[PDB]
Amino acid sequence: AGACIDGASLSFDILKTVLEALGNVKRKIAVGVDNESGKTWTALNTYFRSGTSDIVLPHKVPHGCALLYNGQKDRGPVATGAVGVLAYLMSDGNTLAVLFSVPYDYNWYSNWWNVRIYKGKRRADQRMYEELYYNLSPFRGDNGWHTRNLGYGLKSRGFMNSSGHAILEIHVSKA
């Protein structure tokens, strides 16, 4: 049920179009992850600290394919954002985890994102969220591209804007 587009076609416009497809809520995010790691990824699970998603992770992501995912704040006057982690098991047996954080209150928080490869199979949970958010140098949603050596012969290059209607674009390629 998850859309896997051609890797080379992933763009900011694709993600903005994904945002429009979701309801008109104050906080939501469109995520695009381009797999050019040379290895196939199999969806593990997702962990949402805040907010939810009306879809599921694309089960299988071959090399050359970009998964499209999305999330949103729960509807209602309550002050909640869209905060979560998605995890993918790679063919080498390691875990590629991605954190996205789209807060409600911009006086108290900023958009943050992070990506990391853990050794072995590790499901996304609150422990991984806390680690990726506070301890593992997340990147701020600042409209900038940032490169992060992931280890294991792979690198990441991603972008995330600074507004509630956020888009997060990540490319995982060989180092």
Residues 53 and 95: their CA atoms lie apart, in Å, by 21
Rounded CA Rg of the chain: 15
Ligand-binding site membership of 101 (annotated): yes
**Residue 152 three-state SS:** coil
- Exposure pattern of 27-66 as b/e (b: 16+ CB <10 Å)? bbbbbbbbbbbebbbebbebbbbbbebeeebbeebeeebb
The whole-angstrom separation of Cα 100 and Cα 119 is 21
Look at the chain and report how many structural domains it folds into: 1
Could you give the C-alpha distances from 174 to 10, 79, 159, in angstroms and in order? 18, 40, 18
Bridge partner list, 74? none
CA distances from 69 to 44, 134, 175 (A): 14, 24, 25
Residue 69 among known ligand-binding residues: no
134 annotated as ligand-binding: yes
Any idea what the CATH number is for the domain that residue 130 is in? 2.60.270.20
Cα–Cα nearest to 23, from 75, 59, 60, 76:
75
Resolution for this PDB entry, in angstroms: 2.3
Per the annotation, does 118 bind a ligand?
no
Question: For residue 19, which amino acid is it?
Answer: L
Experimental method, per PDB record: X-ray
**Rounded Cα distance, 85 and 66, in Å:** 17
Domain residues for 103? 1-175
Q: Tell me whether residue 129 is annotated as binding.
A: yes
Q: Helix (H, G, I), strand (E, B), or coil: what is residue 21? A: helix
Cβ neighbours of 139 (radius 10 Å): 21
Q: HSE, CB side, 13 Å, CA atoms: give it for residue 103.
A: 13
Where would I find the beta strands (DSSP E) of 37-164? 41-50, 60-61, 65-72, 82-90, 95-102, 112-118, 139-140, 145-151, 154-160
Contact 2, 18 (CB under 8 A): no
163 labeled binding residue: no
Distance CA 13, CA 117 (A): 27
174 burial level (CB within 10 Å; 0-12, 13-18, 19+): exposed
